[PDB]
Chains A and B, each alone.
With several copies, the nearest count.
Chain A
Amino acid sequence: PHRYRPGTVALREIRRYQKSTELLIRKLPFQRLVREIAQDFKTDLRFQSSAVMALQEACEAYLVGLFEDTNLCAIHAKRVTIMPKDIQLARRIRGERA
């Protein structure tokens, strides 16, 4: 057959997802996680559909913004791949960890 060279699907996967705004985590998975994490701080809580989507709209905004910073670090290391030691450097400079 024919096949696209490692990367050129990615570059497209970028252009696609930058030009769009649909939320990229599956709605129900996320929501279960939210209630999982909420039981910690209080049992038999109830959420407004919107309040779940308010969280999901943030988490995604944040992670997106992180990866942006992450990617600039990986690139700073004359790399193209992102790795944990790039996230951690971002988050340290951001001031989330020590």
Chain B
Amino acid sequence: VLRDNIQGITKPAIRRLARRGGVKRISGLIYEETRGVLKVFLENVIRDAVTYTEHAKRKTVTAMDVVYALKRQGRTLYGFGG
């Protein structure tokens, strides 16, 4: 019902990420640039994940699909069934 959710990654949330980043000062143009890179990254992982879901004739995406996806993408996550 809200077809453009990329926005829900709110400026403050991105600021905080950037803080953990160790960033002191943030150009305004960033947020959108970030939102975009986020979108790509999620898009890429979730594609591979759903591939894995679909390959197992499941209608439900599992935590393991997301790990198999993150491992392929070279982006390996510990603590969900690794």
- Distance (Å) between the CB of B57 and the closest chain A CB? 12
Give A20-38 interface residues, CB cut-off 8 Å to B: 24-26, 28-30, 32-34, 36-38
The interface residues of chain B lying within 8 Å CB-to-CB of A24 are 13, 16-17, 20
Mostly, the A contact residues are helix
Chain A residues within 8 Å of B, Cβ to Cβ? 7, 10-11, 13-14, 16-18, 24-26, 28-30, 32-34, 36-38, 40-42, 44-48, 50-51, 53-55, 57-68, 70-71, 74, 80-84, 87-88, 91, 96
Say whether B6 faces chain A, with CB atoms less than 8 Å apart: yes
Tell me how many residue pairs across A and B have CB atoms closer than 8 Å: 181
Interface residues on B, range: 35 or more
